[PDB]
Amino acid sequence: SNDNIELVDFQNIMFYGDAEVGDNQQPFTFILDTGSANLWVPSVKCTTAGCLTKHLYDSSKSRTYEKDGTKVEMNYVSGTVSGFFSKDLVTVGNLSLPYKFIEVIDTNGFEPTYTASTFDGILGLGWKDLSIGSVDPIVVELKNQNKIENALFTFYLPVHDKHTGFLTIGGIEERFYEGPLTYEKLNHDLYWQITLDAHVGNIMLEKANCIVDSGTSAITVPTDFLNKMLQNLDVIKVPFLPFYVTLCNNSKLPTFEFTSENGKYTLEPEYYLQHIEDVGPGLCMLNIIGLDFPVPTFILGDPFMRKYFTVFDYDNQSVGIALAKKNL
Ligand SMILES: CSC[C@H](NC(=O)Cc1ccc(O)cc1)C(=O)N[C@@H](Cc1ccccc1)[C@H](O)C(=O)N1CSC(C)(C)[C@H]1C(=O)N[C@H]1c2ccccc2C[C@H]1O
After folding, report:
1. For ligand 1, atom 24, which residue shows the shortest CA distance?
2. How far are the Cα atoms of 91, 215, 231, 285, 308 from residue 311, in angstroms, in the given order?
3. Which residues contact 96 (CB under 8 A, 6 or more apart)?
4. CB–CB of 250/234 below 8 Å?
5. Atom of ligand 1 nearest to the CA of 302
6. What domains, with CATH codes, occur in the chain?
7. Which of 325, 1, 320 is nearest to 164 (CA)?
8. How many angstroms is it from 135 CA to the middle of ligand 1?
9. Cα–Cα distances in Å, from 29 out to 10, 15, 36, 39, 215?
10. Is the bond preceding residue 239 a cis peptide, omega within 30 degrees?
11. Dihedral of CA 144/129/23/120: which sign?
């Protein structure tokens, strides 16, 4: 019944999945990003160094290509790509639909991220009004065409050296989680954002905005909240970068607890530490960065999602959260 695209871990920090553009089935690797709402692929017309090692899109070889050519720039927090709109058949798992996407010709504003990673493009899994060009989300559009049961998708993330992951479209599969699945209502029209009380030891923020974001390989915390957490924690900031290093077994490292009237979600140090033995013996980096939004906000990124199976439900305007099964 449901369509299941396999997720591959890349250096236990990112994960990617593959999909196709064109009726000649041109293959691409995507970051799958719940926090954005446009699809893009690098073009054969790309003029920049970053495209050299990528799978490139050739509209001339697809009979289902429809020209648009409207110029567009996608601005991410990690950089900018530019190009123009094109329309073609997009295939995700076994499902296809004609889809508007961005043909990228300049990726120099997205370095060094682009050249250092093995993805080709980004496939947005956000809300329509967050898109450029008023593009209906893939999953919404697939439901509207009755190709899937429900306008929802789920993430069961891969775990480095343990199991593969899945982006599942159309339904919720019991095989991905254990214990209860708790639904948290979205608190915003166009982000996968929910309200949770956030506790880290003695520090807490009542009714914080929490964005569940598949494209962010960190937990982000308000900067003042982070500053309090790190006080007398025996961690050291990396020169010039917003990351902190610690002895891996530092017993002061706290557990994040997020609560709603419905549920309680925790994130222990094992889920947010990254070993860096090559930099030194028994050293870890915290996958936590300080970021201020206009309203106090946490991004519950990839470290959160490695622990917790997540359901993104457009029809019920909610995020479902459950403990991910350790193995399939
Ligand atoms: C609507 S369209 C995209 C939107 N535009 C904007 O907000 C407009 C904007 C542009 C520039 C700016 O100064 C501020 C604003 C954007 O970018 N939303 C992002 C989510 C986001 C949003 C706000 C804060 C943090 C992150 C997006 O969903 C996303 O996940 N991204 C952007 S590409 C990406 C898929 C590689 C990933 C990313 O960067 N990851 C790195 C990251 C990020 C943060 C911490 C550690 C690390 C490590 C890496 O994992």
Report:
1. 77
2. 21, 15, 35, 28, 10
3. 89, 90
4. yes
5. 50
6. 1-174 (2.40.70.10), 175-328 (2.40.70.10)
7. 325
8. 19
9. 12, 10, 17, 12, 14
10. no
11. negative
- Which value in Å is the resolution of this experimental model? 2.0
> How many degrees, rounded to 5, is the angle at CA 83 between CA 82 and CA 86?
140
In the annotation, is 33 catalytic? Answer: yes
Q: Of 201, 214, 187, 190, nearest to 296 (Cα)?
A: 187
Whether 213 is catalytic is yes
CA of 205 to the centre of ligand 1 (A): 23
Comparing CA positions, the residue from 326, 316, 312 lying closest to residue 212 is 312
Method: X-ray
Whole-angstrom distance, CA of residue 85 vs CA of residue 103: 6
What is the distance, to the nearest Å, from the Cα of residue 77 to the centroid of all Cα atoms in its chain?
Answer: 13
Q: Encoding tokens for residue 274?
A: 């990254």
Two tokens, residue 58? 């050739």
Q: Which residues of 203-218 are buried (b: 16+ CB within 10 A; e: fewer)?
A: bebeebbbbbbbbbbb
Rounded Cα distance between 197 and 215, Å, is: 23
